[PDB]
């Protein structure tokens, strides 16, 4: 059938500044079917308190979601987003770069 791989973006709601509260986002879009798994990680350890937007889709039929969680930027804590989907042989992890 027709499947699409998920596109991923990890970024902050507001410009990142160490010590200041913010929101870490993992935007997953362009995937099909809708079944997908997304985890937010702190130094490799999964974060239990997370929120996700309502499932929706584009006029290309592909699905898109936003995953987020409150966080405070640190100079040594590494944040990442992990996604698993039927098009991926193993979960895809994407580190958070405050410059992107």
């Amino acid at each position: 059938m027709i499947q699409r791989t998920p596109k991923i973006q990890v970024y902050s709601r507001h410009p990142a500044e160490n010590g200041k509260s913010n929101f870490l986002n993992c935007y997953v879009s362009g995937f099909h079917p809708s079944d997908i798994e997304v985890d937010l990680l702190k130094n490799g350890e999964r974060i239990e308190k997370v929120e996700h937007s309502d499932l929706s889709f584009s006029k290309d039929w592909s699905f898109y979601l936003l995953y987020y969680t409150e966080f405070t930027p640190t100079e040594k804590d590494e944040y990442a987003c992990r996604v698993n989907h039927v098009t991926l042989s193993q979960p895809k992890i994407v580190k958070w770069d405050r410059d992107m």
Binding site: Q3, R4, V86, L88, S89, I93, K95
Partner: protein, 141 residues
């Protein structure tokens, strides 16, 4: 100028180790997108010209050049396979399930680019034009 090769090869599957190779004082760099994983390699392994990736993922995928000041060595197209599910493979057909605008036919090593006419076209890979170094799992032989 020095040489640049990948031990054990330039086409590696996800999660596997690889080592890039080039008197002393080598410098390695990725063209286009910088590679901060080379800032960490101990210099004792830099002095031996050994730039190894412990477990390779797409973050290491790109073009790498080497030098020591001398002329940058001929390039290196480092490829990561095993990210996406494998496709199925006279005229050879390479049909894929994921929607991809890029297909590769390999002579079992010595591969050959192409394009579809949809998503269709020894083993074959598939990939995305914007990320030509992340390829699918290899097709059935």
């Amino acid at each position: 100028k020095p040489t640049l090769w990948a031990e054990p090869g330039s086409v590696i599957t996800q999660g596997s180790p690889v080592t890039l190779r080039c008197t002393q004082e080598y410098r390695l760099y990725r063209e286009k997108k910088t590679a901060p994983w080379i800032t960490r390699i101990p210099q004792e392994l830099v002095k031996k010209g050994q730039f190894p990736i412990p477990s390779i993922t797409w973050e290491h995928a790109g073009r790498y050049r080497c030098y020591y000041r001398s002329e940058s060595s001929d390039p290196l197209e480092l490829v990561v396979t095993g990210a996406y599910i494998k496709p199925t493979l006279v005229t050879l057909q390479c049909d894929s399930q994921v929607a991809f605008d890029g297909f590769i036919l390999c002579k079992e090593p010595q591969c050959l680019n192409s394009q579809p006419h949809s998503s269709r076209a020894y083993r074959c890979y598939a990939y995305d034009s914007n990320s030509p170094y992340e390829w699918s799992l290899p097709s059935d032989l």
